[PDB]
Design an enzyme around this catalytic site. Sequence first.
Site, PDB file in Angstrom:
ATOM      1  N   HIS A  24       5.637  -1.392  -2.669  1.00 37.75           N
ATOM      2  CA  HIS A  24       4.573  -0.379  -2.631  1.00 37.75           C
ATOM      3  C   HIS A  24       5.186   0.920  -3.120  1.00 37.75           C
ATOM      4  O   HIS A  24       4.999   1.964  -2.489  1.00 37.75           O
ATOM      5  CB  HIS A  24       4.083  -0.129  -1.201  1.00 37.75           C
ATOM      6  CG  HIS A  24       3.281  -1.247  -0.610  1.00 37.75           C
ATOM      7  ND1 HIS A  24       3.042  -1.342   0.744  1.00 37.75           N
ATOM      8  CD2 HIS A  24       2.638  -2.290  -1.184  1.00 37.75           C
ATOM      9  CE1 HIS A  24       2.282  -2.398   0.978  1.00 37.75           C
ATOM     10  NE2 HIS A  24       2.023  -2.986  -0.172  1.00 37.75           N
ATOM     11  N   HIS A  80      -6.105 -12.502  -2.789  1.00 36.60           N
ATOM     12  CA  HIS A  80      -5.867 -11.075  -2.726  1.00 36.60           C
ATOM     13  C   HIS A  80      -5.563 -10.601  -4.141  1.00 36.60           C
ATOM     14  O   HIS A  80      -4.901 -11.315  -4.913  1.00 36.60           O
ATOM     15  CB  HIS A  80      -4.674 -10.905  -1.782  1.00 36.60           C
ATOM     16  CG  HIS A  80      -4.302  -9.495  -1.485  1.00 36.60           C
ATOM     17  ND1 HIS A  80      -5.234  -8.521  -1.214  1.00 36.60           N
ATOM     18  CD2 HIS A  80      -3.090  -8.913  -1.343  1.00 36.60           C
ATOM     19  CE1 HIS A  80      -4.612  -7.393  -0.920  1.00 36.60           C
ATOM     20  NE2 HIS A  80      -3.311  -7.604  -0.990  1.00 36.60           N
ATOM     21  N   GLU A  82      -3.965  -7.592  -4.947  1.00 38.41           N
ATOM     22  CA  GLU A  82      -2.952  -6.553  -5.047  1.00 38.41           C
ATOM     23  C   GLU A  82      -2.204  -6.897  -6.335  1.00 38.41           C
ATOM     24  O   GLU A  82      -2.718  -7.501  -7.181  1.00 38.41           O
ATOM     25  CB  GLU A  82      -2.038  -6.505  -3.806  1.00 38.41           C
ATOM     26  CG  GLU A  82      -1.262  -5.197  -3.774  1.00 38.41           C
ATOM     27  CD  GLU A  82      -0.713  -4.817  -2.409  1.00 38.41           C
ATOM     28  OE1 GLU A  82       0.161  -3.923  -2.364  1.00 38.41           O
ATOM     29  OE2 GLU A  82      -1.152  -5.392  -1.392  1.00 38.41           O
ATOM     30  N   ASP A  84       1.260  -7.873  -6.526  1.00 37.07           N
ATOM     31  CA  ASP A  84       2.362  -8.718  -6.236  1.00 37.07           C
ATOM     32  C   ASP A  84       1.819 -10.146  -6.183  1.00 37.07           C
ATOM     33  O   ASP A  84       2.594 -11.102  -6.161  1.00 37.07           O
ATOM     34  CB  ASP A  84       2.976  -8.273  -4.911  1.00 37.07           C
ATOM     35  CG  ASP A  84       1.955  -8.177  -3.797  1.00 37.07           C
ATOM     36  OD1 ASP A  84       0.891  -7.543  -4.003  1.00 37.07           O
ATOM     37  OD2 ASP A  84       2.234  -8.729  -2.709  1.00 37.07           O
ATOM     38  N   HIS A 147      -5.754  -6.350   5.395  1.00 44.55           N
ATOM     39  CA  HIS A 147      -4.948  -5.673   4.417  1.00 44.55           C
ATOM     40  C   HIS A 147      -5.925  -4.996   3.445  1.00 44.55           C
ATOM     41  O   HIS A 147      -6.108  -3.767   3.492  1.00 44.55           O
ATOM     42  CB  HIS A 147      -4.025  -6.629   3.692  1.00 44.55           C
ATOM     43  CG  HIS A 147      -3.144  -5.947   2.699  1.00 44.55           C
ATOM     44  ND1 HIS A 147      -2.958  -4.581   2.698  1.00 44.55           N
ATOM     45  CD2 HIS A 147      -2.462  -6.424   1.633  1.00 44.55           C
ATOM     46  CE1 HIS A 147      -2.206  -4.246   1.665  1.00 44.55           C
ATOM     47  NE2 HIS A 147      -1.893  -5.346   1.002  1.00 44.55           N
ATOM     48  N   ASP A 166      -1.151 -12.362   2.610  1.00 44.02           N
ATOM     49  CA  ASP A 166      -0.287 -11.412   3.301  1.00 44.02           C
ATOM     50  C   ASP A 166      -0.115 -11.572   4.801  1.00 44.02           C
ATOM     51  O   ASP A 166       0.984 -11.343   5.329  1.00 44.02           O
ATOM     52  CB  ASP A 166      -0.726  -9.983   3.020  1.00 44.02           C
ATOM     53  CG  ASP A 166      -0.476  -9.574   1.586  1.00 44.02           C
ATOM     54  OD1 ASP A 166       0.576  -9.965   1.020  1.00 44.02           O
ATOM     55  OD2 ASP A 166      -1.334  -8.857   1.027  1.00 44.02           O
ATOM     56  N   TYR A 194       7.058  -6.058   9.125  1.00 41.45           N
ATOM     57  CA  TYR A 194       5.946  -6.283   8.207  1.00 41.45           C
ATOM     58  C   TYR A 194       4.619  -5.861   8.846  1.00 41.45           C
ATOM     59  O   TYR A 194       3.865  -5.060   8.285  1.00 41.45           O
ATOM     60  CB  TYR A 194       5.894  -7.764   7.870  1.00 41.45           C
ATOM     61  CG  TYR A 194       4.917  -8.154   6.795  1.00 41.45           C
ATOM     62  CD1 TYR A 194       5.354  -8.390   5.493  1.00 41.45           C
ATOM     63  CD2 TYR A 194       3.566  -8.364   7.089  1.00 41.45           C
ATOM     64  CE1 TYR A 194       4.479  -8.844   4.508  1.00 41.45           C
ATOM     65  CE2 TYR A 194       2.679  -8.819   6.109  1.00 41.45           C
ATOM     66  CZ  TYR A 194       3.149  -9.063   4.824  1.00 41.45           C
ATOM     67  OH  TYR A 194       2.323  -9.578   3.860  1.00 41.45           O
ATOM     68  N   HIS A 227       4.339 -13.953   1.266  1.00 38.96           N
ATOM     69  CA  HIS A 227       5.662 -13.315   1.261  1.00 38.96           C
ATOM     70  C   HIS A 227       6.524 -13.964   2.337  1.00 38.96           C
ATOM     71  O   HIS A 227       6.078 -14.156   3.480  1.00 38.96           O
ATOM     72  CB  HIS A 227       5.574 -11.831   1.612  1.00 38.96           C
ATOM     73  CG  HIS A 227       4.733 -11.019   0.678  1.00 38.96           C
ATOM     74  ND1 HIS A 227       5.068 -10.833  -0.642  1.00 38.96           N
ATOM     75  CD2 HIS A 227       3.617 -10.285   0.895  1.00 38.96           C
ATOM     76  CE1 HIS A 227       4.198 -10.008  -1.201  1.00 38.96           C
ATOM     77  NE2 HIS A 227       3.307  -9.662  -0.291  1.00 38.96           N
TER      78      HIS A 227
HETATM   79  C1  LIG Z   1      -0.709  -0.876   1.684  1.00 32.02           C
HETATM   80  C2  LIG Z   1      -1.776  -0.346   0.749  1.00 32.02           C
HETATM   81  C3  LIG Z   1      -2.731   0.484   1.533  1.00 32.02           C
HETATM   82  C4  LIG Z   1      -3.870   1.113   0.882  1.00 32.02           C
HETATM   83  N1  LIG Z   1      -4.851   1.946   1.572  1.00 32.02           N
HETATM   84  C5  LIG Z   1      -5.882   2.494   0.916  1.00 32.02           C
HETATM   85  C6  LIG Z   1      -6.813   3.288   1.618  1.00 32.02           C
HETATM   86  O1  LIG Z   1      -6.852   3.578   2.830  1.00 32.02           O
HETATM   87  N2  LIG Z   1      -7.906   3.856   0.844  1.00 32.02           N
HETATM   88  C7  LIG Z   1      -8.064   3.639  -0.629  1.00 32.02           C
HETATM   89  O2  LIG Z   1      -9.066   4.208  -1.124  1.00 32.02           O
HETATM   90  N3  LIG Z   1      -7.123   2.862  -1.242  1.00 32.02           N
HETATM   91  C8  LIG Z   1      -6.050   2.281  -0.626  1.00 32.02           C
HETATM   92  N4  LIG Z   1      -5.138   1.490  -1.347  1.00 32.02           N
HETATM   93  C9  LIG Z   1      -5.367   1.346  -2.781  1.00 32.02           C
HETATM   94  C10 LIG Z   1      -4.568   2.319  -3.642  1.00 32.02           C
HETATM   95  O3  LIG Z   1      -4.910   3.637  -3.292  1.00 32.02           O
HETATM   96  C11 LIG Z   1      -4.927   2.000  -5.039  1.00 32.02           C
HETATM   97  O4  LIG Z   1      -4.495   0.607  -5.343  1.00 32.02           O
HETATM   98  C12 LIG Z   1      -4.283   2.837  -6.171  1.00 32.02           C
HETATM   99  O5  LIG Z   1      -4.769   2.372  -7.394  1.00 32.02           O
HETATM  100  C13 LIG Z   1      -2.725   2.809  -6.247  1.00 32.02           C
HETATM  101  O6  LIG Z   1      -2.369   3.995  -7.012  1.00 32.02           O
HETATM  102  P1  LIG Z   1      -1.106   3.900  -7.940  1.00 32.02           P
HETATM  103  O7  LIG Z   1      -1.317   2.766  -9.004  1.00 32.02           O
HETATM  104  O8  LIG Z   1      -1.003   5.313  -8.600  1.00 32.02           O
HETATM  105  O9  LIG Z   1       0.072   3.661  -7.084  1.00 32.02           O
HETATM  106  C14 LIG Z   1      -4.065   0.935  -0.614  1.00 32.02           C
HETATM  107  C15 LIG Z   1      -3.054   0.070  -1.342  1.00 32.02           C
HETATM  108  C16 LIG Z   1      -1.970  -0.530  -0.707  1.00 32.02           C
HETATM  109  C17 LIG Z   1      -1.027  -1.349  -1.480  1.00 32.02           C
END
Ligand SMILES: Cc1cc2nc3c(=O)[nH]c(=O)nc-3n(C[C@H](O)[C@H](O)[C@H](O)COP(=O)(O)O)c2cc1C
Lengths: 398, 398
Positions: A24, A80, A82, A84, A147, A166, A194, A227
């Site tokens: 992250h 998911h 994300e 990863d 998540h 996850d 974690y 993971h």
């Molecule tokens: C552990 C984790 C927690 C997150 N919590 C939020 C959240 O509370 N609200 C939101 O709008 N996005 C959340 N996101 C999404 C990120 O804000 C979003 O994927 C963003 O595109 C990442 O920005 P970056 O590519 O500049 O790092 C979360 C992502 C991860 C991995």
Amino acid sequence: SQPVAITDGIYWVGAVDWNIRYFHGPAFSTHRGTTYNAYLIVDDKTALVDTVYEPFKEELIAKLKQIKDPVKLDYLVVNHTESDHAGAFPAIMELCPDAHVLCTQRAFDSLKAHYSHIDFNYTIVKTGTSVSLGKRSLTFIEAPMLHWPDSMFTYVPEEALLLPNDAFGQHIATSVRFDDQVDAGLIMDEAAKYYANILMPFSNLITKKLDEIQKINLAIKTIAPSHGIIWRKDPGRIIEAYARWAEGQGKAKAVIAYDTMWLSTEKMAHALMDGLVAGGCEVKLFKLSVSDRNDVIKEILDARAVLVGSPTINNDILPVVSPLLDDLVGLRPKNKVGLAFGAYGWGGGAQKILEERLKAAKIELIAEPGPTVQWVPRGEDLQRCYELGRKIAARIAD
Amino acid sequence: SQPVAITDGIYWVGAVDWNIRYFHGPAFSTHRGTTYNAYLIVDDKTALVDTVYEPFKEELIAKLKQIKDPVKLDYLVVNHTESDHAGAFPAIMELCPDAHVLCTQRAFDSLKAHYSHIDFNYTIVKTGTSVSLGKRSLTFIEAPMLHWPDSMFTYVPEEALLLPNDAFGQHIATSVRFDDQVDAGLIMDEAAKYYANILMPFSNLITKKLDEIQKINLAIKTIAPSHGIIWRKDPGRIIEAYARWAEGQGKAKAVIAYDTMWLSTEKMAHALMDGLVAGGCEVKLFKLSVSDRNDVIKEILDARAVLVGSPTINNDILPVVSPLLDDLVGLRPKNKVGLAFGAYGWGGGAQKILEERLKAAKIELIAEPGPTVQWVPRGEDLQRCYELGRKIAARIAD
Ligand SMILES: Cc1cc2nc3c(=O)[nH]c(=O)nc-3n(C[C@H](O)[C@H](O)[C@H](O)COP(=O)(O)O)c2cc1C
Ligand SMILES: Cc1cc2nc3c(=O)[nH]c(=O)nc-3n(C[C@H](O)[C@H](O)[C@H](O)COP(=O)(O)O)c2cc1C
Ligand SMILES: [Zn+2]
Ligand SMILES: [Zn+2]
Ligand SMILES: [Zn+2]
Ligand SMILES: [Zn+2]
Ligand SMILES: [Zn+2]
Ligand SMILES: [Zn+2]
Ligand SMILES: [Zn+2]
Ligand SMILES: [Zn+2]
């Protein structure tokens, strides 16, 4: 390099990431790397559950080819999105354009957003829908905010195999794949780090989901997260653990995080500790500029008390203390008592910020206007801190 | 080990701290250590200006004894009571119980608080008071909040020597003592890092103090700070520098600090940069989890624009970005234009916190509702950022 059989027809085809140290971006520290788990279910129709972090797509494909070369793939489950887990989506889709995507609605939206120059056949799934692969089938369980909004678990009835993605995972790199090939205590500690840094904010959703699975009376014989290690010998331990952590009862433990410039706040930290220990409480003391924030958060998961201290510099708190505070506010620790403390030279200022942030984290202060000292503590100042630690101990009772 | 003569009868008797890497606890990073400067003025009556950080008291005393052994000491000037200058107070006072302390009122209070089982003869000094040592004398200039409430400068008319204590100092360890034995550019850079991280909050007091010294028409031939090199060849440069920095006019430069988890906020940071460079602006780009906060602050001293970016995690900003923000609020950058930016996945949350903290630092936002992107930036999103950087460049004009 080689795929690993979980049972006939079901293989682990993920990738091990030994050298990664931060996940992250800066957010999570992985002292021992991690793995990106992906599963291949072979049948009349073969399905691939999740993909891999883009930089490791080659490993995924290489492992797929070792099972059957012209990669078949009829279904591609995306639990998911994300990165990863969905990073090798383009590569897989390019390898099998006909692959049928099985995912949630929010997942589908995310997928079109992160990639969108990629067309694919699909079907939005909901809790309860089920696809057949022949001898085996895969049913789905939506897991919103377990998540991410698009999260969901995949269940394989014929094998009592749960693929939570996850949930139940641990960030650790090993050449060994199962819980019975790893130290029980060490793997449970990674699992706690974690949970504490990722799932803490959704503890209430965790119990609800655990109950839903409890009522439906799902038979879980093995848990294969996205993971880390696969719980094949004792899934019960990790499930009971999640239940305990989500309940948030805690342990008669207190975590003290702080920092100082000239040691006054430290001496107060020490007095508080002595009171807590005298009150029959276990204490973990962290000087923040020398400790790992994620390791501190892990300790807070079981703690019933969280004390944070800092002197005041330029009418503000010490910047090393900021990360822990903003991290607590977002992680929303459940059922925790707290206290702010620290020294100052003339006007102060850190105490207000500390209490403000601690309350925003929904941590109940055991004392409006926490211990504060000017310049250096004197005998009674430390005595008061000691009594305060003794007070917190009495409350954390047990 | 050996004292160094600044001129006959006036010696440097401080200590060099080569291995220190963090000052003020975690607050200031000293990549090259620092020094604790103390001066001994010998005359019919000998005076010692400031002492040294406790751990180095033996070096101070050893150096004093090489000048004259029975340490004489008639007066002990205490310009500042922080511990890096007053830590060897007990040891000196025990070595010459009859020493006469010359300090400010606030200094005297601090001294009794930090030590208080130590009595000493003294006299509260004010701007203008002056004590005679025989051939030479020392006059004082009160300098409240020129770092601390108790701060003050010591001036030796006969030699046009100014002993500002922290003002005009630089955190650097060298075996060489004067500005003419060091690289002009490197020492000025260290002096900038020093000013930016410590004195920035009091820039208005800096110009007032510089003007008072200007009107009184003080003849300054040499400046001997309590940290670093002694300005013996060109005190003018460092004085002109402080004037320019305190003024806060700035330079057509922009600093962009940020971090990401998946690169979207970084791509935005990049777009913003291209716009700023296209608009004829110098840009410094800092990924916070991999840069030194103090080095980032140093760049902001000269910058007219400060852009801070961050994705949103758990409805909050990324923890690594917190230190820089709470540090800017306390440092109160003067006359700066700013902008907050970042990605998010669904609800967002970081943008609010960023703008709130940026405003608290009294940094004028060039756009309420700064650039925000959901998931990944698209062509127009980056174009918009580029235009915004172009806009800020126009304003930073020059
Ligand atoms: C552990 C984790 C927690 C997150 N919590 C939020 C959240 O509370 N609200 C939101 O709008 N996005 C959340 N996101 C999404 C990120 O804000 C979003 O994927 C963003 O595109 C990442 O920005 P970056 O590519 O500049 O790092 C979360 C992502 C991860 C991995
Ligand atoms: C650079 C610096 C800035 C400071 N700013 C403030 C301030 O704004 N307000 C205050 O009340 N004290 C201030 N102090 C004083 C400290 O809060 C005080 O010395 C305290 O005793 C140090 O706590 P510690 O020994 O736990 O580090 C400052 C000290 C230093 C070195
Ligand atoms: Zn290999
Ligand atoms: Zn690659
Ligand atoms: Zn198309
Ligand atoms: Zn003890
Ligand atoms: Zn020596
Ligand atoms: Zn010692
Ligand atoms: Zn005593
Ligand atoms: Zn470019």
